[PDB]
């Protein structure tokens, strides 16, 4: 009966508004039968007992990073090399920082080089931001029996770290790690005894002059491109031997060092991958020959 | 924000003996950043002599 | 033998109260739960080229995305076994439309790794146009004979719910996922390789 | 030698009661924080050209648009040397559409400086159809390593949030910018030298 | 299931409206994760304590506008005249006054004139709006030993400032304000004895017969031109010795003024510059030949 | 998180809907600085009394 007294509204046409967002009003048509359709808690859906999702626990999961091989021929004050990768000199970043390239034949005129990172679950995750925060944790081990005796140093350098870019790929300089040209002294260390302890866990708080770091890691990293690897871990820990392996004969001149990773007290920044490349896991071929799928960064 | 700068004058005869060394002038003209922030990362072990 | 102990070095500080300084500074947000990374939606394909009138399962697009890796629904999926809740899509349209044409979309039900050919064309729907609506959202419901459901397993089919696409013109649009507020992963396992730089080279 | 005084001429009345006297007669409003013009859009380019399928970083835009100094954003800058927060970017399309097409805007995150070949294209995204909506407003987040940064210093890359810029055809908009409601410059500085008209002349 | 009992609300498709306003809400999709992201507060982001962008404070911020040189040749009754730009006559106005012209050649045919405005923190403000409004604060200085003595004047005149236009420029006429033709004996002044006081900051509140006061300075002002230059002052203070200077000849015969600038109680109107060009910050070419970036007022 | 819950409103393209009306919102876009910009009352503005 009566006419309008409501003013005229102010529009714009923009379906899906923010739809990247977690949290807000989703718009979608959902195809049930009523409008408050929902699913009932977790309980009784999933045996694990804590929220298998939060950021903190996912990272928390430990995961063996190298397994370096102890010679009682090794010198001291000498990162344990050893191919592996890495290890004397653990990045301490929370990205991924090891990585091995598969090559495969195309022609005689070239070849197909391929990434491939082994990131465990914490540098898994770190791959999905663009910059982390956290403290690094690590439990070293030494397979051994109680015949071995010896007593293995690790110290923390902070700053960038000494290594040897490759026309594909980036190694340590071992070379400018020695008891001689890197004294240890003034470096936050520990001194495991193999006849005292087995195992000891080191937790690096996070230190960088920088508010975040880039969890780049070892990405796309080479001789042309090695700034965002450096940017991307805050320091290294080193485990030189303070004192030769001792063993007799009537057991291994050898000792396993098992060396765990995670995180904890982790915060990740933006929500985008700080690569230059989607995300994409590797999914190893039929045989050594077969090709991979490479995605790339064009739209239609 | 403002007086973004100092000017003239000053009292008579001063120390400032900043550890070693002292040093006698007539008072000083001095700025500071108007009340000045940490605004940095120091929490980490401080250590010492 | 055995023992065992634990160091922190440096002099502690709420690594926490750190962090949220840090993130009041230099973020604005506080990321904490994955699963909070279901709910946000994000593009798997640029570009996903329909026929006129065929009726064709997001199955055939999402076996193959699932794989990848690229969204956050794949890429989380490699960390646990199971799964378990709906899901949300959203079509934005790409394709030219010609005024001799009246182009819809229609989406509907269907069972999980069913063929269109094996499946009716009725039960609850949603319609759009592309010509005053470009975004075609829409949600599917968990009707599952199970309370959890793992990825890829034997030949349980018809078992949940699926998503049947369909448009009375040839269409091709940018597609973008996540699950509802009830969609979540479930018994973590480990992460496998992650993939780099391919740019090929003469030795 | 030394002393000083201060004087202030005629009879003093309160100089603010003036004025604000002053704006209740001859403008309404009363600015005080110059911050508040960093709220405010202003135009910097009254027509940005841009190609088909070409993710154009604005910072393209944006290094030239700093030094002018016609908008308040980069006008202010000269007064400070550093800045905090984030951005805000509004896109007027003035493109000639074709029906034939399907015009659409993406814009998508990005490090600063960073080179859209060097970047992927996923994470957060926006996008918009100026058939139906000629104003692709977005707002970038402060994503940074720091808690300010002063601009233009060292090979200080990918430390902070750029904006990256797409469309599936070739494109021509006003552009106006602004800085969210976190954005701030610090540590002033003396101001440079103004400019005046130009005509040229003979002798 | 009951049907639709709301009334039809009008429309209008109007996108960012009013996006031109400081308040309000953006329609600005944010491209994060939290729909409520926000940064904290400035605390230990900057190290000033005060609101680094307050007007008040801004223009507060003090500034050398002239450096005349007082000979004890000088005749008193007399504007320090001199080069430098001004100064025996101070515009007293908020906005720019002085400015050079930067002439280069383009050819043998004609040279390409631009004006250089060395703007002080408050003139360069003033320059963002139409009109201002506040009080004009000078602190004089006289840089001399215990030597030198004087008596310097300095008075206030409202009104127009007698002026000699150029083809291209606007300086003061000093032939018209002599002790003789200006004589300051009503004009509100002040008399520093160089040897009592070294000092004196004078704060002349807004007076103009009007609210307030154009913001066009000397932008673009010259014989055809000099009309919005008048109505953007409102007077001018005058510098004309009272004693002439003595100085011994074991000293300098030379005592160098410095003039500081900046308001207080400042109160600007419309947000945009009444000049006749878009803002621009004249940028120094590398070569005193080089040609500088001209902004035009066309949309295309 | 959840989905819409809110009903299809009802529309109509009427853009200046009774502008020929004294009283009501004027939909102009004020070309200044402040949303509520407005002027004070007219006392000293002019010389009349009423």
Known sequence: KPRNQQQVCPLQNVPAWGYSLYKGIDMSVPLAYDPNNELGDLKDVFPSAVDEMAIGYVCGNPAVKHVLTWKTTDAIQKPIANGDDWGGVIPVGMPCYSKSIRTIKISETENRETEVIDAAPCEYVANMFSYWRATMCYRITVVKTAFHTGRLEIFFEPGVIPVKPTVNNIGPDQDQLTGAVAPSDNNYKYILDLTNDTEVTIRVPFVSNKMFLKTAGIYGANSENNWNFHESFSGFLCIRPVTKLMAPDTVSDNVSIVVWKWAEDVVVVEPKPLTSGPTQVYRPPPTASAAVEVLNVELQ | ?49 | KTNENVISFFDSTDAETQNHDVLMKGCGEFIVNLRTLLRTFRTITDNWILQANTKTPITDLTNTTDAQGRDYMSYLSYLYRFYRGGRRYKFFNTTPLKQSQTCYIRSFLMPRNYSADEINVDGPSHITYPVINPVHEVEVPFYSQYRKIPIASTSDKGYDSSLMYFSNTSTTQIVARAGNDDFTFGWMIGPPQLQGETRSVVP
Chains 1, 5 share one sequence.
């Open chain 2, 1 to 49: 924000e403002l007086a973004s700068s100092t000017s003239e004058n000053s009292v008579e005869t001063q120390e400032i003996t900043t550890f070693h060394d002292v040093e006698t002038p007539n008072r000083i003209d001095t700025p500071m950043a108007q009340d000045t922030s940490s605004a940095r990362n120091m929490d980490d072990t401080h250590s010492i002599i």
